[PDB]
Amino acid sequence: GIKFSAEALRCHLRDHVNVSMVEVTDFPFNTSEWEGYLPKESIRTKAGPWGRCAVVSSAGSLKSSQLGREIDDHDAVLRFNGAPTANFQQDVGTKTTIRLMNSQLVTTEKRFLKDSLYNEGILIVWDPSVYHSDIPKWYQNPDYNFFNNYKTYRKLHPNQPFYILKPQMPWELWDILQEISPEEIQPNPPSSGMLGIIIMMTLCDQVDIYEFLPSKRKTDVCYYYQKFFDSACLLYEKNLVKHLNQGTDEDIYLLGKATLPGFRTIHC
């Protein structure tokens, strides 16, 4: 089992994980090649602070969940990668406030530069670095070289806020996942879902998380918008979220809903 309490784990996350974006003052994003590309205003001036927020997993158990009104009844909603609301609004809601994407999508998915779903809300892209790398070292060897398509999207959509997560943040979170499950952890970075939860805990007083912990609807379907199975179709991440959950067991089983307090509200 996990050795620390929920209250202590929340404080450890607040203190060890630096939720911040690459800034125009971080070398080499202050080079002439990068001038004008990054947002100059912090995400904290575009995003909140908010009272009640939703994080919507991309899990297949959202299909037929009819969670759309529950999700939309929030100040802000975060979604992941290419997860759509169109044709699914009754299950997953209509609002998209923040969309967190991995660098694989930005680098290799041609629809990133074509599909209008990406044009709504605030965008964040993240890329897994080598563990313990700083920004200059990471820049020389990203997991996916997403920088060109980032720049292209910025030019096509200059007034949509589009941030890059600092590379240190996923591994800081990994450190805490290892503390709580050292014998089971894999040397892969946390999932986008886990990152998005921590991001919303930084911007919100209360974070409701839908179908990250499995509900009655647990299914073989990997993602709610999947049309069939292919090569496209975590345990310690779920245990962390369960450990921090303030909601009822009934909310998990029926609504697939966990509720986590935001960092602004905890006492350390």
Ligand X SMILES: CC(=O)N[C@H]1[C@H]([C@H](O)[C@H](O)CO)O[C@](OP(=O)(O)OC[C@H]2O[C@@H](n3ccc(N)nc3=O)[C@H](O)[C@@H]2O)(C(=O)O)C[C@@H]1O
In the complex, least distance from residue 196 CB atom to ligand X, rounded to whole angstroms: 7
Known binding residues for substrate: 58, 81, 102, 191-193, 222-223, 238
Q: Count CB neighbours of 90 within 10 A.
A: 13
177 near 237, Cβ under 8 Å?
Answer: yes
Q: Which segments of 137-251 are extended strands (E)?
A: 162-164, 204-210
Q: Which residue ranges make up the annotated binding site?
A: 58, 81, 102, 191-193, 222-223, 238
- The minimum distance between CB 218 and ligand X, in angstroms, equals 9
Q: How far apart are the first and last CA of the chain?
A: 23
Which residue's C-beta sits nearest to ligand X? Answer: 193
DSSP assigned state of 165: B
Which is nearer to ligand X, 26 or 74 (by Cβ)? Answer: 74
At residue 241, φ and ψ (nearest 5 deg) are -70, -40
Minimum distance from CB of 80 to ligand X (Å)?
4
Residue found by looking up tokens 């997953």 in the block: 92
Structure tokens at 110: 């041609």
183 or 230, CB closer to ligand X? 230
**Pick 3 or 110: Cβ nearer ligand X:** 110
**Total count of residues recorded for the chain:** 268
We find the least distance from the C-beta atom of residue 65 to ligand X, in angstroms, to be: 13
> What is the smallest separation between the CB atom of 113 and ligand X, expressed in angstroms?
14
Residue 207 and residue 182 in contact, taking contact as beta carbons nearer than 8 Å: no
Nearer to ligand X, 26 or 167 (CB): 167
Q: Which residues bind ligand X (CB under 6 A)?
A: 57-60, 80-82, 102, 104-105, 191-194, 212, 222-223, 232
Q: Which two three-digit tokens encode residue 33? A: 């090649």
We find the least distance from the C-beta atom of residue 172 to ligand X, in angstroms, to be 17
Is the CB of 130 or the CB of 222 nearer to ligand X?
222
d(CA 147, CA 151): 6
Instruction: Give the DSSP H or E segment for 10.
Output: helix 6-16
Tokens of 189: 């970075």
Q: Which structure tokens are listed for 115?
A: 């599909």
Q: Among residues 37 and 144, whose Cβ is nearest to ligand X?
A: 144
